[PDB]
Amino acid sequence: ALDLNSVLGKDYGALKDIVINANPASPPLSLLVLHRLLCEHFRVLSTVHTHDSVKSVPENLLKCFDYQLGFTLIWKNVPKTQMKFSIQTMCPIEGEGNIARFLFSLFGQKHNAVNATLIDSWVDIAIFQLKEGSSKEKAAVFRSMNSALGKSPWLAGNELTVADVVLWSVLQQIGSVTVPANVQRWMRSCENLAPFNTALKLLK
Template sequence: MPMYKVKPVSPGDIKIDLPTCMYKLPNTHAQGMNCGEHALQFTSNEQQRLPEILRKEMDHIRKDGDDDDDMNGEVDPALKALEERQDEVLRRLYELKATVDGLAKTVTTPDADLDASTLSRGPAESVFRGTADLDSLLGKDLGALRDIVINANPAHPPLSLLVLHALLCQRYQVLSSVHVHSSVSVVPPPLLSCLGPRHIDSYARQRFQLGFTLIWKDVSKLQMKFNTQSMCPIEGEANVARFLFRLLSAEPQDPLAATQMDCWIDTAVFQLAEVGSKEHAAVLRSLNSALGCSPWLLGQEFSLADIVCACCVLRAGQTTSAAANIQRWLKSCQNLGHFDCVNPLLQ
């Protein structure tokens, strides 16, 4: 039995129209409303198309302003200020979009860090004067920096890649950085600065064309990653050197010269750098004989064969005891200025 009973304060059949939201907003597209009554609402899809929406809205405002100008013969100062403010907002939005796209490319690249530093440019003029278009070489990729990530063992520094890195810097705007993987405990200081000092604009990735990241890591074979979504890793210093050399658009057009270049590269990597004294001496004799007929290994043109072979000879440390033709050739390579970046690593 209840203690007491309260009579209802309102009729039981009353109907209340409850709202579906906390408050209502006027329709922004209704006719007869002024700009002050507009309250824009964007869905998730519209937020992604914000620059396009703002541009269309601005075109509509400008059209209305042109109609008013035709009737009155003068420009409303408030409308002019609104146009200038809208142009500035659109400019900043496009810059922000380019920055976000660049950061997204970095995050999806394995072993790459957001910190970046660049290299010092070589003092000598590049011998490769051909024109190169990255869109034609690597495919069109708008709004993102093309990142080249290389994992190398500090016990065997890839000298030829450092030389190619210096050549790439003379051709493109390159954003470079050096990192140390957790698998490596100690790295000599020259290896940490082999790509040059930190660039003051390293935070603005959209200002560069290429990203060159060198990671000192405990790996058995050098590995390069470029496009992780549609390209498998490239292994071996010779193969990576070929890839980087193609970015310079300096490959021999003659099939015979291209074959000779590949033969010298394979000979240097597999016989001059990794085998015993007998094979090493035989390769040096062949090298001295070829250089006795021409200034460079392919004749009158400096090529990737000279870069790779010279780096292998310099790494072996037998430059003083080498034959006369080899010593002359090494001096010619040094005079180009492209090998200045590897000299600190040879001391």
């Protein structure tokens, strides 16, 4: 796997420090999980702040956390989770699915075109179908997941990917439908990981 430097490239320096704006009424569990994953792998300086946009953030949210990455979470009254970078030639990045993809990419694991796209496809299913979705659509998503998870331990293969992080996390924050067997197995395999159950209990 690729080192952090070559992953970010020329501006490793620019991107080493990450800022995320999140709404306390809608904390992005997927990012919390990914923060935990990053900390296991990298030396990470983390910080929480509270924008004047909001008042009375609960404590767990407030206490939710020579380095390699800087990682600042700001509670704010934003309509959508948003990541900003020091380079501001670029646009702010909106949507936890997109931020999660970037963060997961920091681990430098290589994927061919098919597998990388399959991973992206699962993140979109989480964001575009599951999260704001119908009950009926949710059952269809479950069927599709159930089929994939009958063929491999994780959504996109033999390794954990951002597909798993995002889809598991979204599933926790919507709460109904019968959970099929492969999905149940996968759910407990996810929750068995410290980064996952740790972040989840934070949101209590």
